[PDB]
Amino acid sequence: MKQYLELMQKVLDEGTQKNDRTGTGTLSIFGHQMRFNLQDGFPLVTTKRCHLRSIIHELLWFLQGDTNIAYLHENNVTIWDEWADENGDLGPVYGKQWRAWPTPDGRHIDQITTVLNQLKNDPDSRRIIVSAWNVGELDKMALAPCHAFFQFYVADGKLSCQLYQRSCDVFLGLPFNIASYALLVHMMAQQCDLEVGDFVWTGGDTHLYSNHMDQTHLQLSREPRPLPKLIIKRKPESIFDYRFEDFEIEGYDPHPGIKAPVAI
Amino acid sequence: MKQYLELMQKVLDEGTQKNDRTGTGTLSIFGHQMRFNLQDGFPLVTTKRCHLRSIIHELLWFLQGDTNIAYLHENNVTIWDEWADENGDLGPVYGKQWRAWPTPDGRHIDQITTVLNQLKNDPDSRRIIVSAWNVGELDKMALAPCHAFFQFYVADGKLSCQLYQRSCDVFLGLPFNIASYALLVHMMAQQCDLEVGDFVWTGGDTHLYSNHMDQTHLQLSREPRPLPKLIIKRKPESIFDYRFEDFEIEGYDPHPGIKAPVAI
Ligand SMILES: C[C@H]1O[C@@H](n2ccc(=O)[nH]c2=O)C[C@@H]1O
Numbered sequence: 001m002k003q004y005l006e007l008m009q010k011v012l013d014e015g016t017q018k019n020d021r022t023g024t025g026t027l028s029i030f031g032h033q034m035r036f037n038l039q040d041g042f043p044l045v046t047t048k049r050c051h052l053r054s055i056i057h058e059l060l061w062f063l064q065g066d067t068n069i070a071y072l073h074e075n076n077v078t079i080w081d082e083w084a085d086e087n088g089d090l091g092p093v094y095g096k097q098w099r100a101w102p103t104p105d106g107r108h109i110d111q112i113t114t115v116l117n118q119l120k121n122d123p124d125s126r127r128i129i130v131s132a133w134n135v136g137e138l139d140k141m142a143l144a145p146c147h148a149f150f151q152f153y154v155a156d157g158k159l160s161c162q163l164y165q166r167s168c169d170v171f172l173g174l175p176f177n178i179a180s181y182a183l184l185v186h187m188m189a190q191q192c193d194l195e196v197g198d199f200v201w202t203g204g205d206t207h208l209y210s211n212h213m214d215q216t217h218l219q220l221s222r223e224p225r226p227l228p229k230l231i232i233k234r235k236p237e238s239i240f241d242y243r244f245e246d247f248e249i250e251g252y253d254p255h256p257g258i259k260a261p262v263a264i
Numbered sequence: 265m266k267q268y269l270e271l272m273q274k275v276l277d278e279g280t281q282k283n284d285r286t287g288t289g290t291l292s293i294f295g296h297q298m299r300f301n302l303q304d305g306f307p308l309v310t311t312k313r314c315h316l317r318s319i320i321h322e323l324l325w326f327l328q329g330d331t332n333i334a335y336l337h338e339n340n341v342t343i344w345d346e347w348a349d350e351n352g353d354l355g356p357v358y359g360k361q362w363r364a365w366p367t368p369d370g371r372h373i374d375q376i377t378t379v380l381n382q383l384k385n386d387p388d389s390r391r392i393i394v395s396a397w398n399v400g401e402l403d404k405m406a407l408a409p410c411h412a413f414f415q416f417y418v419a420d421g422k423l424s425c426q427l428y429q430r431s432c433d434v435f436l437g438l439p440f441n442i443a444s445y446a447l448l449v450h451m452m453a454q455q456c457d458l459e460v461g462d463f464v465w466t467g468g469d470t471h472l473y474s475n476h477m478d479q480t481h482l483q484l485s486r487e488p489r490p491l492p493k494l495i496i497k498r499k500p501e502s503i504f505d506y507r508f509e510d511f512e513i514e515g516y517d518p519h520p521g522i523k524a525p526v527a528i
């Protein structure tokens with residue numbers, strides 16, 4: 001995508017040499033924002049082939065409030081293996097905070113039903129936010145939330161959403177984070193009978209690992225391809241009743257996939 | 265300021281007509297980001313005179329973890345009167361979340377000392393965040409946090425900071441929110457022996473009230489003036505030991521102040 005290749009370029013020209021946790025060097029910038037009008041097509045990077053089936057399964061797993069790897073394993077989605085313990089537990093990460101934020105007085109707040117309530121009954125609200133940055137539970141999580149906070153917005157029958165991402169690997173992680181959230185805006189919108197608007201991505205420490213330079217130069221050689229179209233084949237009775245098979249991506253013709261190795 | 269007058273202009277040309285809580289119309293945009301290099305001068309709007317003494321007193325009140333209006337009243341700072349109850353309580357708003365975030369298991373987390381710890385002992389961290397969006401305490405607060413979340417960043421001896429603001433009145437509220445946070449970056453930096461970097465402002469629903477149009481047209485007539493210089497006269501033994509008198513703004517020559525009325 002134009003906006004993503006423009007960000008790759010900006011990290012190469014402007015990033016400072018910053019290191020990662022006792023490891024790999026990165027070229028890093030702080031504070032970046034991009035906008036994707038979801039009416040123009042689904043924001044899946046076409047300059048390298050991306051596989052959406054793990055993205056869909058991870059999103060539907062978050063909406064169930066699930067913190068264990070079992071569901072993902074039943075579908076042979078293995079993206080969280082690296083963080084899970086011996087029982088498949090990841091601690092109170094995303095799904096638990098989205099669906100059951102624990103209060104000091106023993107309540108569990110379902111921020112996803114709150115947000116639907118607000119989009120339907122109070123759409124002009126400037127408080128339509130779900131947060132996964134629960135400070136009192138960060139020590140028990142396998143990793144602190146990268147996509148920590150997001151806000152919905154409704155104007156002229158269109159639902160927009162801004163994601164704050166505290167940390168971002170532009171090569172490996174970001175194409176996956178944009179598709180996952182753009183998919184959530186389409187599901188939210190379908191349920192509130194609203195059209196899709198913008199997905200605004202805001203990042204904090206936005207970086208490229210040093211051992212992904214050959215791959216970032218190769219991808220910047222490629223011309224972007226027309227963006228695909230997401231079709232949802234069914235309208236579920238609620239946001240918690242979607243299935244893997246309900247989604248189809250139409251017209252996706254990417255360039256070949258590029259591998260990116262990681263240090264250990 | 266150039267970046268602020270450019271945002272005022274963008275809300276007038278691009279904002280949609282959106283209403284406020286059972287009230288006033290607004291022209292509104294969603295998702296905006298501005299950058300202020302704090303080495304170029306202190307980001308206090310010069311196209312209208314702004315009074316910094318309430319800003320300083322409110323910031324030092326937040327750092328004490330104070331949720332009652334008494335301190336502000338002792339200094340005849342009256343900006344929070346509208347929200348306080350009969351005893352001067354505002355509920356668990358900002359200061360309480362910054363200094364004593366309550367956990368489910370009875371702890372109180374001091375996010376401001378955590379952040380100093382990280383800037384000194386682990387400055388390359390991508391997790392140096394303080395959050396005031398405590399979902400389980402939002403019902404007891406006088407108002408939900410507008411400046412909800414912020415992240416620090418260190419690269420090349422320079423401390424930067426990004427603020428996420430869910431809601432923003434561009435005329436009345438934003439010049440005050442930029443100065444308050446730019447002042448916190450200078451205090452943090454002094455305490456960690458780092459230089460100042462950038463203040464990146466990110467907003468969510470960024471708006472102009474309809475009954476501030478004459479005033480926004482008047483301010484856009486004015487040419488910006490050279491930015492002032494903040495001098496801190498003393499280095500306190502910690503971030504909690506600053507006093508009103510430690511700060512001076514040097515070289516501030518604004519245009520006259522403009523009044524902005526509010527509906528009730
Ligand atoms: C932890 C490293 O992986 C990155 N990362 C992790 C999770 C995610 O959703 N997106 C992302 O980009 C952040 C940092 O570069």
Ligand SMILES: C[C@H]1O[C@@H](n2ccc(=O)[nH]c2=O)C[C@@H]1O
Pocket residue numbers: 410411431432433434436437438441471
């Ligand atoms: C509640 C109204 O006042 C605005 N507001 C409030 C507090 C603050 O720090 N900044 C700000 O701009 C948000 C919205 O426009």
